[PDB]
Ligand binder design. Structure first.
Ligand SMILES: Nc1ncnc2c1ncn2[C@@H]1O[C@H](COP(=O)(O)O)[C@@H](O)[C@H]1O
Ligand SMILES: Nc1ncnc2c1ncn2[C@@H]1O[C@H](COP(=O)(O)O)[C@@H](O)[C@H]1O
Ligand code: SF4
Ligand code: SF4
Ligand SMILES: [Cl-]
Ligand SMILES: [Cl-]
Ligand SMILES: [Cl-]
Ligand SMILES: [Cl-]
Lengths: 255, 255
């Protein structure tokens, strides 16, 4: 019903005279709200380093903030512990529940007013369990409140000259069996980079960790790129060198 | 050092005037020793039906015996129970330890003299744990004692006009996670027959059961037969219809 300018103006009216903390991740959503908050209010983009994202990813987030003149701080957290390594069922809840607690801490030592996150309108019709953990503590989702779409976000990002980066997705999601270890996520990430580089899988690729078995996930059109037996033999041999017991391919290719 | 005729004659000298029970399975090894025992001695080929081999396999064994005039009896056993469904580490030991006990029972109610099995010379340089369980109780392996090779067995089978059947291998081996259930082995067997029929995988094929995940094992030359995405989509969809949670392909193809 409302258009983008009305939404954009509504967004600026909200940030007026507010001390804003953005849960900044480097993604398109969070960066867009971080930039709009920086230009109209006293804003701090806080990145909580869980150990679930690669160094490249955190550096990318830090640089984007320095590029767009977003005031940004990163907090490396010792999050991986024995209670957290187990309980894989609620990892996302615990993950975001902890991040929320650190943001709330930064907010009250800084004595800022609100904390916002880049949750968009589309995200509300999903099973996002960490939005349970986040929207458990007071956490404002302004893009979601103003009915911003994925296109509304991408579109306003172009006008504001924010480059659309390629999405880096949580490494702990590759871990299908407890515990979420630093080494297990490494085992997948190396496997993913090796496959992606030697066989050029630009589209969706995943190497799941299931009890030291690597499960390769790929897209329907990328498929032929690994169908010859010399490519398969190289992947199985290299992924086992990384220490997977068996290397397998999930035959449910993404449509 | 010794030739086949000397071995063959040595074999006939051993069975002379002996009441022989053969642990008959229908395989090339067991059938050959069953036939030579039948023609020179009062012999009974006993098949112990574990629930680990398909009906086709037992029928094939029964028919081969009736075809070669081998006196044969089959004993269906209630072997699958709660202690036996678990303890997958020693399945083979328990498997053969039980079969041995039934053969020993048949032997002493019949008051026969010896029990023999088709263990060949080549088999002695393998980790065969049920030969531990078998050669735990007195169990004579005459082909092994007389240095019979795989070729010595195949060769003498041709002279004696015993057809070489295609080997049917234990279904419980497809089960990689406790428990070895009747339904789980079914889940693999159906999967195997479906893949083997619709895509013509004549060479080595396996569908392992690992916590309701099907792991497809195939040979290097058969590989291209399932490499197109319409073949993969059909297999993943059908094997999940059988009730596997995920359908995966082991990228360690047999050389
Ligand atoms: N480095 C980070 N700093 C702050 N929040 C993060 C970070 N990485 C991931 N998140 C959180 O991850 C959630 C959504 O991203 P994801 O669930 O990882 O795709 C949001 O609630 C973010 O707060
Ligand atoms: N139906 C059967 N009757 C008697 N022994 C069997 C039967 N099926 C399998 N075996 C045993 O299986 C062992 C070797 O075959 P396998 O280990 O199944 O490849 C031998 O010790 C046989 O006694
Ligand atoms: S995917 Fe889950 S574990 Fe990873 S950052 Fe998001 S909520 Fe945390
Ligand atoms: S493979 Fe193992 S379980 Fe199957 S028949 Fe042989 S010893 Fe028994
Ligand atoms: Cl304060
Ligand atoms: Cl979530
Ligand atoms: Cl008696
Ligand atoms: Cl064995």
């Amino acid at each position: 019903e409302k258009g983008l300018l009305e939404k954009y103006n509504s967004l600026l009216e909200f940030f007026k005279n507010k001390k804003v903390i953005v849960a900044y991740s480097g993604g398109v959503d969070s960066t867009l709200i971080s930039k709009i908050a920086s230009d109209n209010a006293q804003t701090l983009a806080v990145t909580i380093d869980n150990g679930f994202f690669s160094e490249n990813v955190i550096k990318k987030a830090e640089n984007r903030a320095k590029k767009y003149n977003i005031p940004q701080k990163t907090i490396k957290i010792d999050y991986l512990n024995e209670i957290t390594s187990k309980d894989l069922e609620n990892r996302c809840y615990n993950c975001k529940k902890r991040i929320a607690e650190e943001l709330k801490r930064i907010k009250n030592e800084l004595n800022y007013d609100i904390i916002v996150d880049g949750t968009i309108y589309d995200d509300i019709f999903e099973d996002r369990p960490g939005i349970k953990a986040f929207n458990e503590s007071n956490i404002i989702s302004p893009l979601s409140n103003l009915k911003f779409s994925k296109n509304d976000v991408f579109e306003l990002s172009n006008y504001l000259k924010i480059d659309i980066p390629k999405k880096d997705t949580c490494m702990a999601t590759r871990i299908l069996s407890a515990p979420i270890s630093k080494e297990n996520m490494a085992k997948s990430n190396l496997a993913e980079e090796f496959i992606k580089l030697n066989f050029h899988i630009e589209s969706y690729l995943r190497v799941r960790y299931l009890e030291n078995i690597a499960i390769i996930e790929l897209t329907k059109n990328e498929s032929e790129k690994i169908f010859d037996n010399d490519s398969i033999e190289r992947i199985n041999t290299e992924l086992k060198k990384i220490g997977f017991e068996k290397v397998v391919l999930d035959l449910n290719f993404k449509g």
